Amino acid sequence: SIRSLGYMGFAVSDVAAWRSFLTQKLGLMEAGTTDNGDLFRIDSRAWRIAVQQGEVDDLAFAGYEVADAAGLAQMADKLKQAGIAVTTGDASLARRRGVTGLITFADPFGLPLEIYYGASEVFEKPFLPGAAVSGFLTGEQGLGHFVRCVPDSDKALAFYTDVLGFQLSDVIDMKMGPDVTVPAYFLHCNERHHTLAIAAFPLPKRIHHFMLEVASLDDVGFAFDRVDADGLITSTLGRHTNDHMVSFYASTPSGVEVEYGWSARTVDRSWVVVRHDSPSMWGHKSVR
Amino acid sequence: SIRSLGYMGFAVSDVAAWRSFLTQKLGLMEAGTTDNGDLFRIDSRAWRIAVQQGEVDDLAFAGYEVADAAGLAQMADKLKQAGIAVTTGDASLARRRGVTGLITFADPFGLPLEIYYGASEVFEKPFLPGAAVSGFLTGEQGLGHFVRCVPDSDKALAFYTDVLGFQLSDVIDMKMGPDVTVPAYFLHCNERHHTLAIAAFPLPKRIHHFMLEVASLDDVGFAFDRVDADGLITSTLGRHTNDHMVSFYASTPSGVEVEYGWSARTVDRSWVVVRHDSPSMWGHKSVR
Amino acid sequence: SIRSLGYMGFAVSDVAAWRSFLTQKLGLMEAGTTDNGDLFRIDSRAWRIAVQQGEVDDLAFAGYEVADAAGLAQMADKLKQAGIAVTTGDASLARRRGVTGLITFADPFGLPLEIYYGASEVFEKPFLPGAAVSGFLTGEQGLGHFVRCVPDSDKALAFYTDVLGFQLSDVIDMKMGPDVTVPAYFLHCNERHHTLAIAAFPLPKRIHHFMLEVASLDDVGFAFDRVDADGLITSTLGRHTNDHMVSFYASTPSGVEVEYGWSARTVDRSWVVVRHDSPSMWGHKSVR
Amino acid sequence: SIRSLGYMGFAVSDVAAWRSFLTQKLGLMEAGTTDNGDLFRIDSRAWRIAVQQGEVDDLAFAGYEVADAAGLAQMADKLKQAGIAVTTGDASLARRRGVTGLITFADPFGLPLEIYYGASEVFEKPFLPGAAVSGFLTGEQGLGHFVRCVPDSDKALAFYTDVLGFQLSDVIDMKMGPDVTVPAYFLHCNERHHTLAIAAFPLPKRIHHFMLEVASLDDVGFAFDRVDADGLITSTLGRHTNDHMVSFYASTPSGVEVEYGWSARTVDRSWVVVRHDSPSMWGHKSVR
Amino acid sequence: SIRSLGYMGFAVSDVAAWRSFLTQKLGLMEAGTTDNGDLFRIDSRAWRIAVQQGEVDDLAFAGYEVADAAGLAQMADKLKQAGIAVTTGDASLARRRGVTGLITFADPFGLPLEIYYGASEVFEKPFLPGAAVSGFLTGEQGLGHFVRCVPDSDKALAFYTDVLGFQLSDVIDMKMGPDVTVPAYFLHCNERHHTLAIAAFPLPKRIHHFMLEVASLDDVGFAFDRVDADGLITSTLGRHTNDHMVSFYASTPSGVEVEYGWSARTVDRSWVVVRHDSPSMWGHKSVR
Amino acid sequence: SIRSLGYMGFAVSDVAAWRSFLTQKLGLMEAGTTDNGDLFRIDSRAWRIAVQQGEVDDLAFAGYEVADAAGLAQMADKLKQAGIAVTTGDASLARRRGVTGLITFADPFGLPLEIYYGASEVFEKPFLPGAAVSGFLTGEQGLGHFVRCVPDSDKALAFYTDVLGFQLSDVIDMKMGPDVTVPAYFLHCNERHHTLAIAAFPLPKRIHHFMLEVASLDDVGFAFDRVDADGLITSTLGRHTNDHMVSFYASTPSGVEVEYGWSARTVDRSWVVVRHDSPSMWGHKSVR
Amino acid sequence: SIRSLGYMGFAVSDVAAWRSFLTQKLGLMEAGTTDNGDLFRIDSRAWRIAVQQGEVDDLAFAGYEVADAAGLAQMADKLKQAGIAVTTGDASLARRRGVTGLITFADPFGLPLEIYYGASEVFEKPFLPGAAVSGFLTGEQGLGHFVRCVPDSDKALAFYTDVLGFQLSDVIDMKMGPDVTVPAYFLHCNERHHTLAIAAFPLPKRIHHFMLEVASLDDVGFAFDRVDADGLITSTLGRHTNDHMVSFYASTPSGVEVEYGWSARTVDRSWVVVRHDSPSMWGHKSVR
Ligand SMILES: [Fe+2]
Ligand SMILES: [Fe+2]
Ligand SMILES: [Fe+2]
Ligand SMILES: [Fe+2]
Ligand SMILES: [Fe+2]
Ligand SMILES: [Fe+2]
Ligand SMILES: [Fe+2]
Ligand SMILES: [Fe+2]
Ligand SMILES: [Fe+2]
Ligand SMILES: [Fe+2]
Ligand SMILES: [Fe+2]
Ligand SMILES: [Fe+2]
Ligand SMILES: [Fe+2]
Ligand SMILES: [Fe+2]
């Protein structure tokens, strides 16, 4: 059973731009370069984000974490029974990722996905942010979340809930013009309101944005100014209606956006599915 | 599995009287008028109470909330297996209610009931009460409760516990004269002591009263004076023996009573069924 | 320096009525009869209220407590310097009161007052209320408070603040008819909002009422019913604007009223004098 | 000794614009119209802000609160000894202000000031905001603060600290162009970081802005959108370096600005005077 | 100004009996033998109790602690001004006591007293009790207390309060037979209810008992059994009326009694002098 | 189901050296000598560590605790079904161990193991440490942990997880020279991070070390000095990467090492298996 | 009145060595270079430590902070009245230090001292440590402390307590060989146990060491390893007897030592002067 989103990899045209953006603007810690690419940390894990040179300028792969080898076995079985082509990652791939075991496959629309267990901790190399950030919120909530853009929401929903086991949190009916309303589905696999959201948005990328959550309002405020100085803000500060996250959005060097937030609410056992007609309570004025 | 009482609809002869009563006396928020009727809010939900023009001057329908589509499916199945005529609400009804999916049916004595999932939240339109009220208690406890008057308690009990899944909290043996003692059954479907009570009282209405719970004693005290000014109090302040709610009762424009209270105790896993011979510890002097 | 109101004595025409009223209706503990009269307790002190046979049917004397012999000396000095006739209570009076030392004198309008130190504690005879009362609030706040009716508020104010050292909390402009508005002054000598209030009300008694404070809302609710059963309620439950006490008023056998309340706010160092135009936020409907 | 800023009065050309702005945009409560003008509330006090028709379109007077009559006497004495012309407000003025006693005078540069005691509380008329605002922070910190623009900071400083008793919190060296740096002095008279700030800014008004503090971040976020809808924002959200208040600034109908904030830090006994070179840690981007 | 009782010395006929009694029965830590005698610890101080060979079999001296050299100077001055013969302890005595400076003198009835400052801490030799005791309560409350038996209470009271600065906590009128009632005065010099008590009891010793306070009820219960095994209990478990200490009394090898207790209440600024007619609420049955 | 490690027995060549080491250096309580050997306590249990004369100078047996007789039955069954030779301990062995029932068997490499239920508590003989130790952490976490050295980790892992039911916490890849990397597996059976660790280290003993956990940092610091005085430290203070325990290692008289630590983190339900490349975050410098 | 130690300046032969040592080993933040020298931060202040090129390789000056201009005036007066040559720092010096006002002078043995008020805060440039350090403890406790080596302790003591106003915390009798015992005096000017210590040690430097306090044990543990890697440790981890600080000592490039600690206890109003015979409870083994 998937416990959380553990890592993400980006294939970009300008690795140097990404390195500077992640460390200097967002405050991630540069963790060295390997055959896995330029590695970045936000907590005790050896790496959470990998940046590789590539033409797509987009998310290259995402890794979901299971608790142990038994969990990995369960997921592999579930995928096989669904008719999904799964490959047991070889020792070489596992070593490149710094994990104990992993299986690879793709979502219905081609995004490479990996499910693994036994990632590497580096408590002996204490996290030191590249910019003044009090801390990132990970732990049992994992890395954060991303919005997967798809041509068919229903097919995507079936795969992610029925095969991968994500549960629906809520739905937001996104009004994109008079004749267009697109539902965005927010899914969770742990306490974090959503680890994955699915929407049929007409975008050139695999994801609309990925999100990192910090520990204090000041972390967000300071980062906003750092990013704004280079004219990269896409949405002003605001609070979402569903996860109640206070955040701003900015453009990464690949055009993909990043959401930097704080104070999101979590999902509990008493949670009930609801719907919203707006994605924000206040703020989030588009400056794109 | 029913999680809570989510909404109620009243069909009344004087809509204007009801609008003024709910907002000015009780402090609910006017949420506009639609084909669902005059809508009123007490929290983040788009509406909790609907008032429509009608001859009965009584509760027209009540909606019970399930967590998701799977829960809706379970309830529909349970009702069918019991031989209850259930209708899957059409898109038109779902849109009128602002819900994602719903099924309709009636209790053994004709009260229209609806079970739904995915109601609408409006966090972007912050709740502002029509009178000075610090807040209403809803959340996982839902809207509040109401007492269903029935000609046969046993038949009602079987339907609500065996088919709808409510659990018994306790029973109060209501002494109505020397030769008449009527048991009132209090049922819960969540932490709230009771979301539904059943009693064979000789009343012209479907319910004896509905109850709204507020956040502080002052909310109750101030509302009492507002209502008393118009001579609408039916019972003085008092505390119930079973749910320990401190409340007063007042008459709505339809003759149906409303209970306005604070500080009720909740039901836990260690709860045991008990019986009482009085409905109140103190107060609740009838001024009818 | 006066620390609190320590005890009160009533001279009544019907001692038996008072005994039954204090124990059975209010829940005080009968503490025996001595040459000090019928004694009643509300806490660890040997007695707080004394009832003696007398014609006035009113408050006979009140005792204010100082911390020690030095404090007693200071007050005696302050009174003498003001030209007040003070008498050092003799051993006989001190023994009758159960105190270590005391001085006696009268307020400008004839109320016998006593200032003493070293009252008797009886921890070995644990307090057991005469009715179900969770507890009375005394401690550093003392016995409670009473409203002294006077023919001239200014003369009374000068004596109580300038000579006795009470400090003003606030003032309420009591509208008693179109052509009559009487200011009521509320004074404190410790954390309790007011230990004494002064008003020029046209009453046949020395005090409008005395107040006892209990530990929970239920103590008040249950007592209300006990008193109401005998038709002795004079004001329904309500909350005051100044001390925020939730209370009801009832008539004692002497016609003097008693206020029975809970949850009053205290005065701190940041306190500032204010004025009010109403004595109650809600409730306190006169049923006299 | 001045305890806090208690009330403010504005003399404006468009009273209707102000009424709508204060209630609908900021969420203040309309408290009626008297010979004191249109009254607005933010807490239990009968009024905190008065709006009168006038030509100046600016702050007309400010009232500082003392604890009692003795405090009023002390301040009057202090002012007289300093050679300031003080007038004991007559009963008529006191009644218009709803206070017990007050003295009037002006600061060195003509701003009418009033020091009073015994303002009116209206707990019986519970505060109900004109817009969704969880609450305003007042209490011992008073109304909020305002920045007094003066032609000579040193003369202003001497008057406010030496005569009125305000204490310096800190100083910010405001860089207004290459050849101009103006120090802004922040003063406190209670826990609130500053109740008054003084700066020699070249402005047509007596004050740069006045500030109201709310209870939650959402209060600020929602108000920002309400104000932004009418294009009245002058500074984006940001946090100050000295009081650590998270706020935005907006233009009132008189051109005077209002700061609406949350989460300011307070001053304690361990406080030490410091200096800053920037007024904001992040945000507060001028959109004027 | 005296801060607390810091140490005590006993001159006994059987040093070995005392050593075994203090360590094995009471749980004190043996701290070695010096020219100061056999030393015992209960906390971080180098010693709190000294046992020397002597004929009196009683308390030989007691040391009161001041905060510093200035405090020592003040006390010496106060004693001289009172006509008390004070001797500045010489380096030899200071070294024997392990203190920085001290003055010696005697109470009106011959008990040698010492006031000192700068005692020795031995944090490097962690306290290890001689029996299972969770801990002793000392800190700002000092060593504990003792009851000084005197032939004239008034003379003793004057010396201890007027010269040494102790303050009265309360008085207990000890009924010793029909024709004899002796007042016991309890005095404090810090938070501990009493550090010294004075009574004119007809005893052959300088003190009735000394008291040590432990951290838990079990410490008392276990010690009771250890002492009871040797038939040394003089009073069963009980709770005092004034300090609310739960304790038992036992006989030391010198006939002087020791009180071993737990959970005493402290004295605060709001404390007022009171009187009691019994020394115990419950228990303390004499088995002498 | 195994609840914890309950006791351990050592067979040593120098019993006297062990007695002095455990009590004087580590602070364990000497609990007498029986046919079970020299017994030592760390909490309420009659004994936790037994020292017997023997040639191996190593761990002789370890006892795992189940909750009751049903649990014992389950484990016996599980072992039998796995083909392990289990012997139901006879009354004589049970009496020697002070347990109610037990079964004996051996791990795949010859270590005698015992699973038992109903050990003896001795609350009537309160724990008193042999050295200044505030306390040991046991309770639901049991005695502590030990590292089992084995020739084949996989065979050991299968036995301990599949048969005994331990769960994997994490793995540390121990770099022992350029051509040697040995994985150490850490297993838990309760909240304690690990009760057992398995590694194929080339050591002459059955275990690398056993660990005792104390309540405060000072307990560790003081013990370090006691042990260092005799030159027995093998690793300086440091903190582990996996359990986050702050500890030092020392040599026992048998050559087997003991780890003495504080502040380890526990394992919860959200725990996920991870891997590390270093066993320590800081410190733990080998001084062997 | 001196509130705390605010800043320190070092005049060193190798500025580059110091820069690398402070940032990489200790984790201070490099704050730029000015005419005040290389500046380093540990909190919101613009700088706390300045490093200048110089021959002495020692502490060049220390700055003590007063609350405001009045405090500065008081200290200047106190120094003048004592016959100390004080110089009012000129605008140039104040600007170089980044303070509002300051006075300069020297201690009896030539150490340049400065007392100032109104230092610069830089909240807009959030602190980012040069190494992984969770945080430094400053606030009302100031920078930390240093031990001033003097040829005559009594003369130094008189100056620091009688003129500068420091208060004695405690004394440690340092045994430096059989025929030498030197008392070290620890003084405080706020809650920090000691801001200054004085001892007549035979050292070539003005101070034995300066101390920085961090927020967690790990900060100390990690720094220890960083420093140990270069062989700069002078004392192993240990805890002091007087301030209870857990720390290690290391050599700076100037030979002066630095103490890096955590968890020191503070001084309160109940504090009493004591003496110790050892400076450490455990650890602090000299490896010099
Ligand atoms: Fe879920
Ligand atoms: Fe997002
Ligand atoms: Fe239930
Ligand atoms: Fe009800
Ligand atoms: Fe007061
Ligand atoms: Fe009253
Ligand atoms: Fe101040
Ligand atoms: Fe402001
Ligand atoms: Fe006292
Ligand atoms: Fe005692
Ligand atoms: Fe587990
Ligand atoms: Fe270990
Ligand atoms: Fe001090
Ligand atoms: Fe130090």
Distance separating alpha carbons of residues A274 and A267, to the nearest angstrom = 12
**Dihedral over Cα of G165, G171, G175, G179: its sign:** positive
Q: Do G222 and A126 touch (CB under 8 A)?
A: yes
- Residues of chain F contacting residue A98, judged by C-beta atoms under 8 Å apart: 275
- Residues of chain B contacting residue A170, judged by C-beta atoms under 8 Å apart: 121
Nearest by CB: A126 against G126, G127, G132: G132
Q: Which residues of G are annotated as a binding site for Fe cation?
A: 145, 209, 259
CA of D234 to the centre of ligand 11 (A): 56
**Pick from C186, C150, C146, C142: which is nearest to C168 by CA?**
C186
Q: State the residue for tokens 């510890």.
A: B281
B81: which residues sit within 8 A by CB, 6+ positions away?
A: none
**3-state SS, one letter per residue, for chain G:** CCCEEEEEEEEECCHHHHHHHHHHHCCCEEEEEECCEEEEECCCECCCEEEEECCCCEEEEEEEECCCHHHHHHHHHHHHHCCCCCEECCHHHHHHHCCCEEEEEECCCCCEEEEEECCEECCCCCCCCCCCCCCECCHHHCCCEEEEECCCHHHHHHHHHHHCCCEEEEEEEEECCCCCEEEEEEEECCCECCCEEEECCCCCCCEEEEEEEECCHHHHHHHHHHHHCCCCEEEEEEEECCCCCEEEEEECCCCCEEEEEECCCECCCCCCCEEECCCEEEECCECC
What is the separation of C-alpha B92 from the centre of its chain, rounded to a whole number of angstroms? Answer: 25
Q: Are F5 and F143 in contact (CB under 8 A)?
A: yes
CA of A216 to the centre of ligand 2 (A): 17
**Dihedral over Cα of B217, B222, B223, B228: its sign:** positive
**Pick from D257, D266, D262, D254: which is nearest to D237 by CA?**
D262
Q: Which chain A residue lies closest to G131 (C-alpha atoms)?
A: A128
CA of D266 to the centre of ligand 5 (A): 24
Task: Report DSSP state, residue C224.
Answer: H
Question: What is the C-alpha radius of gyration for chain F, rounded to an integer number of angstroms?
Answer: 18
Task: Report DSSP state, residue E109.
Answer: T
Beta strands in D127-256 (DSSP E): 145-149, 167-175, 181-188, 196-199, 207-213, 233-240, 246-251
- Residues of chain D contacting residue C188, judged by C-beta atoms under 8 Å apart: none
Distance separating alpha carbons of residues G191 and G213, to the nearest angstrom = 14
Q: B1-132 has which CATH code?
A: 3.10.180.10
Calculate how close chain E gets to F132, using CA atoms only, in Å.
5
- Residue of D133, D214, D224, D285 to mutate, interface with A, max A Cβ within 10 Å: D224
Neighbours of chain C (3+ CB pairs under 8 A): B, D, E
- Partner residues linked to G173 by β-bridges: G183
D221 shares contact with chain A (CB less than 8 Å): yes
- Token digits of residue G208: 């034995």
Q: Do C272 and D67 touch (CB under 8 A)?
A: yes
Are β-strands D49-53 and D4-12 bridged in parallel, bridged antiparallel, or unpaired? Answer: parallel
Distance separating alpha carbons of residues A240 and A253, to the nearest angstrom = 25
Are β-strands B233-240 and B246-251 bridged in parallel, bridged antiparallel, or unpaired? Answer: antiparallel
- Residues of chain B contacting residue D222, judged by C-beta atoms under 8 Å apart: 126
CA of E260 to the centre of ligand 10 (A): 8
- The amino acid present at A57, given as its one-letter code, is D
Question: What is the C-alpha radius of gyration for chain C, rounded to an integer number of angstroms?
Answer: 18
Task: Report DSSP state, residue A288.
Answer: -
Give B233-256 as a DSSP string. EEEEEEEESSS--EEEEEE-TTS-
Calculate how close chain B gets to A170, using CA atoms only, in Å.
8
Distance separating alpha carbons of residues G136 and G132, to the nearest angstrom = 11
Q: Which chain D residue lies closest to B124 (C-alpha atoms)?
A: D222
**Pick from C43, C47, C48: which is nearest to C123 by CA?**
C43
CA of E71 to the centre of ligand 10 (A): 27
CA distances, E262 to each of B75, C124, E138, E226 (Å): 61, 18, 12, 17
CA of B270 to the centre of ligand 3 (A): 9
Q: Are F123 and F44 in contact (CB under 8 A)?
A: yes
Task: Report DSSP state, residue F163.
Answer: I
| Secondary structure (3-state) at D283 | strand
F238 shares contact with chain G (CB less than 8 Å): yes
B215 shares contact with chain D (CB less than 8 Å): no
Give the count of beta carbons closer than 10 Å to the beta carbon of residue C268.
8
- Token digits of residue C132: 């179900």
B136 shares contact with chain C (CB less than 8 Å): no
Q: Please name the residue ranges forming H helices in chain E.
A: 15-20, 69-81, 91-97, 153-157, 217-228
Q: Are D223 and D232 in contact (CB under 8 A)?
A: no
Distance separating alpha carbons of residues C18 and A1, to the nearest angstrom = 73
- Partner residues linked to C262 by β-bridges: C246
CA of D149 to the centre of ligand 8 (A): 13
| Secondary structure (3-state) at D18 | helix
- The amino acid present at B253, given as its one-letter code, is P
Nearest by CB: B132 against D126, D132, D222: D126
- Token digits of residue G238: 């240990």
- Token digits of residue G180: 């030498």
Residue E15, φ and ψ in degrees, nearest 5? -65, -35
- Percent of chain B as helix, strand, coil, to the nearest 5: 20, 40, 40
CA distances, F175 to each of A95, A100, F205 (Å): 16, 17, 20
**Dihedral over Cα of E184, E185, E187, E193: its sign:** positive
**Pick from A204, A122, A121, A207: which is nearest to A156 by CA?**
A207
- Token digits of residue B272: 């045991």
Resolution in A: 1.9
- Partner residues linked to A106 by β-bridges: A112
- Residues of chain G contacting residue D171, judged by C-beta atoms under 8 Å apart: 100, 118
**Pick from A5, A9, A237, A260: which is nearest to A140 by CA?**
A5
Q: Do D222 and A246 touch (CB under 8 A)?
A: no
Q: Are D130 and D29 in contact (CB under 8 A)?
A: yes
Q: Are F106 and F62 in contact (CB under 8 A)?
A: no
Give A30-87 as a DSSP string. EEEEETTEEEEESSSBS-SEEEEE-SS-EEEEEEEE-SSHHHHHHHHHHHHHTT---E
- Partner residues linked to F30 by β-bridges: F40
Calculate how close chain D gets to A225, using CA atoms only, in Å.
6
Nearest by CB: G119 against D271, D274, D280: D274
Q: Are F156 and F182 in contact (CB under 8 A)?
A: no
Distance separating alpha carbons of residues C188 and C211, to the nearest angstrom = 14
**Dihedral over Cα of B118, B119, B124, B128: its sign:** negative
Question: What is the C-alpha radius of gyration for chain E, rounded to an integer number of angstroms?
Answer: 18
- Token digits of residue A277: 């007609």
Distance separating alpha carbons of residues E71 and E64, to the nearest angstrom = 11
Secondary structure element (H or E) that encloses residue F1, with its range: none
Q: Are A160 and A64 in contact (CB under 8 A)?
A: no
Distance separating alpha carbons of residues A61 and B189, to the nearest angstrom = 44
A vs G: CB pairs below 8 A: 14
- Token digits of residue C47: 């007695």
- The amino acid present at G180, given as its one-letter code, is V
Q: Do A68 and F241 touch (CB under 8 A)?
A: no
Distance separating alpha carbons of residues E209 and E279, to the nearest angstrom = 14
Contacts by E182-189 with C-beta closer than 8 Å and gap 24+? E183/E153, E184/E147, E184/E279, E185/E153, E185/E157, E186/E242, E186/E243, E187/E160, E187/E161, E188/E267, E189/E2, E189/E3, E189/E4, E189/E5, E189/E64, E189/E164, E189/E165
Specify the domain boundaries for CATH 3.10.180.10 within chain G.
Answer: 1-132, 133-287
Task: Report DSSP state, residue C164.
Answer: T
Question: What is the C-alpha radius of gyration for chain B, rounded to an integer number of angstroms?
Answer: 18
Q: Are D153 and D200 in contact (CB under 8 A)?
A: yes
CA of B66 to the centre of ligand 1 (A): 13
CA of D269 to the centre of ligand 7 (A): 6
Residue D215, φ and ψ in degrees, nearest 5? -80, -25
CA distances, D49 to each of A204, D46, D205 (Å): 54, 10, 18
- The amino acid present at E265, given as its one-letter code, is R
- Token digits of residue B79: 């009702």
Give the count of beta carbons closer than 10 Å to the beta carbon of residue G29.
23
Residue G189, φ and ψ in degrees, nearest 5? -135, 5
Task: Report DSSP state, residue F141.
Answer: G
Q: Please give all residues whose CB falls under 5 A of ion ligand 14, grouped by chain where several chains appear.
A: G 211, 259
Distance separating alpha carbons of residues F181 and F179, to the nearest angstrom = 7
- Token digits of residue B35: 């084909």
The b/e string for G235-269 (b: 16+ C-beta within 10 A; e otherwise) is: bbbbbbbbbbbbbbbbbbbbebbbbbbbbbeebee
Task: Look at phi and psi of residue A261 and say left if phi exceeds 0, alpha if psi is from -120 to 50, else beta.
Answer: beta
- Partner residues linked to C65 by β-bridges: C4, C116
A219 shares contact with chain F (CB less than 8 Å): no
Distance separating alpha carbons of residues E104 and E75, to the nearest angstrom = 11
Distance separating alpha carbons of residues G129 and G23, to the nearest angstrom = 7
CA dihedral E161, E164, E166, E168 (to 10 degrees): -10
Secondary structure element (H or E) that encloses residue C225, with its range: helix C217-228
B5 shares contact with chain C (CB less than 8 Å): no
- Token digits of residue G229: 């890697």
Distance separating alpha carbons of residues F184 and F279, to the nearest angstrom = 9
Q: State the residue for tokens 């309580």.
A: F29
| Secondary structure (3-state) at D235 | strand
- Residue of G154, G185, G272 to mutate, interface with E, max E Cβ within 10 Å: G272
Q: Please name the residue ranges forming H helices in C39-134.
A: 69-81, 91-97
- Residues of chain D contacting residue G121, judged by C-beta atoms under 8 Å apart: 170, 241-242, 274-276
**Nearest ligand, measured from the Cα of D167:** 7
Degrees to nearest 5, angle at CA C128 with C124 and C133: 145
Q: Which chain C residue lies closest to E239 (C-alpha atoms)?
A: C124
Q: State the residue for tokens 């970045």.
A: A40
What is the separation of C-alpha A80 from the centre of its chain, rounded to a whole number of angstroms? Answer: 25
Task: Report DSSP state, residue C139.
Answer: G
- Partner residues linked to B183 by β-bridges: B173
Q: Do C118 and E273 touch (CB under 8 A)?
A: yes
**Pick from A253, A223, A213, A259: which is nearest to A21 by CA?**
A253
Calculate how close chain F gets to A110, using CA atoms only, in Å.
28
**Pick from F275, D263, F54, D39: which is nearest to A120 by CA?**
F275
| Secondary structure (3-state) at B138 | coil
C65 shares contact with chain E (CB less than 8 Å): yes
Distance separating alpha carbons of residues A124 and A154, to the nearest angstrom = 45
CA of D233 to the centre of ligand 2 (A): 26
- The amino acid present at B85, given as its one-letter code, is A
Q: Do F221 and G238 touch (CB under 8 A)?
A: yes
Beta strands in chain B (DSSP E): 4-12, 29-34, 37-41, 49-53, 58-65, 87-88, 101-106, 112-117, 145-149, 167-175, 181-188, 196-199, 207-213, 233-240, 246-251, 257-262, 274-276, 280-283
Q: Which residues of C are annotated as a binding site for Fe cation?
A: 145, 209, 259
Calculate how close chain G gets to E66, using CA atoms only, in Å.
7
- Token digits of residue A205: 């990328």
D129 shares contact with chain B (CB less than 8 Å): yes
C285 shares contact with chain B (CB less than 8 Å): yes
Q: State the residue for tokens 């005998």.
A: C230
Give E218-275 as a DSSP string. HHHHHHHHHHHTTT-EEEEEEEESSS--EEEEEE-TTS-EEEEEE---B--TT---EE
CA of F188 to the centre of ligand 11 (A): 7
Q: State the residue for tokens 């009024």.
A: D47
Query: In the β-sheet with G101-106, what is the strand arrangement from edge to edge?
Result: G29-34, G37-41, G49-53, G4-12, G58-65, G112-117, G101-106, G87-88
- Partner residues linked to F196 by β-bridges: F146, F187
- Token digits of residue B80: 């069918």
CA dihedral E157, E163, E165, E167 (to 10 degrees): 20
Q: Do E124 and G281 touch (CB under 8 A)?
A: yes
Distance separating alpha carbons of residues A78 and A93, to the nearest angstrom = 22
| Secondary structure (3-state) at E69 | helix
**Nearest ligand, measured from the Cα of C166:** 5
Q: Are A241 and A172 in contact (CB under 8 A)?
A: yes
- Residues of chain E contacting residue C117, judged by C-beta atoms under 8 Å apart: 272-273
Q: How far apart are the first and last CA of chain A?
A: 39
**What is the fold of B133-287?**
2,3-Dihydroxybiphenyl 1,2-Dioxygenase; domain 1 (3.10.180)
G275 shares contact with chain E (CB less than 8 Å): yes
Q: Are A205 and A4 in contact (CB under 8 A)?
A: no
A269 shares contact with chain B (CB less than 8 Å): no
**Pick from F86, F94, F115, F82: which is nearest to F1 by CA?**
F115
The b/e string for E132-161 (b: 16+ C-beta within 10 A; e otherwise) is: bbbbbbbeebbbbbbbbbbeebeebbebbe
Q: Are C88 and E244 in contact (CB under 8 A)?
A: no
Q: Please name the residue ranges forming H helices in chain F.
A: 15-20, 69-81, 91-97, 153-157, 217-228
| Secondary structure (3-state) at B75 | helix
Contacts by D158-165 with C-beta closer than 8 Å and gap 24+? D159/D107, D159/D108, D160/D107, D160/D187, D160/D196, D160/D198, D161/D187, D162/D82, D163/D78, D163/D79, D163/D82, D163/D84, D164/D2, D164/D64, D164/D75, D164/D189, D165/D1, D165/D2, D165/D78, D165/D189
